[PDB]
From TrEMBL, chain A:
UniProt name for this protein: PopP2 protein
Reactions this protein catalyses: L-threonyl-[protein] + acetyl-CoA = O-acetyl-L-threonyl-[protein] + CoA; L-seryl-[protein] + acetyl-CoA = O-acetyl-L-seryl-[protein] + CoA
Signal peptide as annotated in the record: none
Keyword entries, A-Z: Acyltransferase, Transferase
Entry keyword annotation includes Lipid metabolism: no
Species of provenance: Ralstonia solanacearum (Pseudomonas solanacearum)
Length: 335, 67
């Protein structure tokens, strides 16, 4: 039992505190892991709040946090699902018909999804910001996995994209992807219709095939559906230029109101700094706990901007919203 | 790096991990769908000793070994 004012203060205060530390880190060009800042915990705690705020800020976004079987297994999962997360199967069984965006936690990793549910069934287009498998055939498995959690009869597309390079940025990247899905609501709706009618997907995406076991549509190249604006937070310059080299038509479109192309915006966000030394693609790692790399800042800045937005939202939100957010934060910090 | 299993597996995940130089791989049984098999395994090259592989198996197979 506490007043609305107190609760409001605890929610914006949490958000502001996170913001303070992240902004300090970013301004000093420090890696959070090396600085021993618990990014995973904070991201997990702020995400429900960000989702509430973004849903209010963009009517029709309809973003929902979902999780899979493994996310309920204490022995395997990296951390519990965020506060207010619902199991995919419970959502598909019980949600009202309509159009949703989702962030889906598989127990270790979070992806974005655009979901359409109606009386004739459910379809989902999953966009994974991480593309870490050397062997692309691996993704057949992934596609099947997501499909069998939505149910055999749900139509599913799985689209892995080479955006994420860190171990922790999946949640913010997925949130951003969901915002972009909403932004491209029509194009994703067109793909949904195509999935449901069992049509030719080659008009929507560049590389696609159905899996043998579940008939899920695995999309190994999602352009032009995955367009330039969805690649804005790509952390490796090499990933962005490989994308643009593969889809030159994407290289000339403005990705913001500053009229930057993808290439230009990415180069503006390049920073150089120390991160924990980790193995590369073929699993080779040098000696020493750290390595210096050059990568794009963009996701860092995004997290900070989203936190600003959410704090602003909470500062003026009606009492029921404040009480809902306070309960989400309280349930988060229980971990 | 001498992994061997009496079983068949498909990929579930592959991700970098807090505090580790080496990524973790997540697998589930090839008969998860056909037989409802719940068996999963996690594979991660050891941080401290780079020569050692750590492997965790969870849940039991509900079917004989794939002969
Ligand atoms: O090359 P690969 O072997 O494909 O991946 P590698 O790990 O070697 O680094 C690849 C890219 O990811 C980027 N990257 C690697 N680790 C991280 C990280 N933790 N955070 C952000 N970016 C990263 C590197 O800067 C590099 O960018 P470049 O390719 O534009 O130089
Ligand atoms: O107009 P949107 O497509 O909805 O993008 C808006 C935002 O708009 P505003 O701050 O003006 O209200 C920025 O766009 P610009 O002002 O630069 O034109 C920004 O984009 P930048 O990072 O390139 O500056 C970022 O978008 P993004 O995540 O793509 O980087 C952001 O948030 P949303 O896209 O989630 O609405
Ligand atoms: Zn099995």
């Amino acid at each position: 039992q506490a007043t609305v004012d107190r609760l409001r203060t605890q929610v914006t205060g949490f958000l502001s505190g996170a913001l303070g530390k992240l902004q300090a880190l970013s301004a000093q060009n420090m890696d959070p892991e090396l600085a021993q800042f618990r990014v995973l915990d904070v991201d997990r705690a702020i995400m429900p709040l960000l989702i509430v705020a973004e849903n209010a800020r963009n009517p029709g976004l309809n973003l929902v946090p979902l999780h899979m079987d493994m996310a309920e297994d204490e022995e395997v999962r990296t951390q519990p699902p965020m506060a207010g997360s619902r199991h995919i199967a419970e959502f598909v069984a019980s949600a009202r018909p309509g159009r949703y965006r989702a962030v889906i936690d598989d127990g270790s990793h979070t992806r974005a999804a655009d979901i359409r549910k109606d009386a004739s069934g459910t379809s989902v287009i999953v966009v994974d910001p991480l593309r870490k498998e050397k062997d692309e055939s691996a993704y057949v498995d992934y596609a099947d996995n997501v499909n069998m959690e939505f149910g055999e009869h749900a139509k599913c597309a799985f689209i892995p994209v080479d955006i994420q390079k860190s171990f922790f940025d999946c949640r913010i990247l997925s949130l951003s992807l969901a915002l972009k899905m909403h932004d491209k609501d029509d194009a994703f709706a067109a793909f949904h219709e195509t999935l449901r009618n069992g049509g030719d997907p080659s008009h929507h995406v560049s590389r696609a095939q159905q899996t043998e076991e579940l008939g899920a549509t695995l999309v190994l190249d999602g352009a032009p559906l995955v367009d330039a604006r969805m690649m804005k937070h790509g952390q490796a310059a090499s990933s962005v230029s490989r994308y643009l080299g593969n889809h030159p038509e994407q290289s000339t479109v403005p990705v913001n109101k500053r009229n930057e192309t993808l290439g230009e915006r990415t180069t503006r966000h390049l920073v150089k700094r120390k991160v924990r030394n980790r193995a590369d693609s073929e699993g080779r790692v040098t000696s020493g706990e750290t390595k210096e790399i050059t990568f794009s800042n963009s996701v860092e800045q995004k997290r900070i901007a989203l936190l600003n937005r959410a704090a602003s939202y909470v500062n003026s939100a009606p009492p029921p919203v404040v009480m809902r957010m306070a309960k989400l934060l309280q349930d988060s910090l229980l971990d | 790096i001498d992994e061997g299993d009496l079983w068949t597996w498909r990929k579930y995940g592959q991700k970098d991990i807090l505090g580790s130089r080496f990524p973790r791989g997540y697998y589930r049984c090839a008969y998860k769908f056909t037989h409802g098999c719940k068996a999963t395994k996690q594979v991660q090259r050891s941080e401290t000793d780079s020569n050692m592989l750590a492997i965790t198996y969870l849940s039991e197979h509900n079917h004989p070994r794939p002969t």
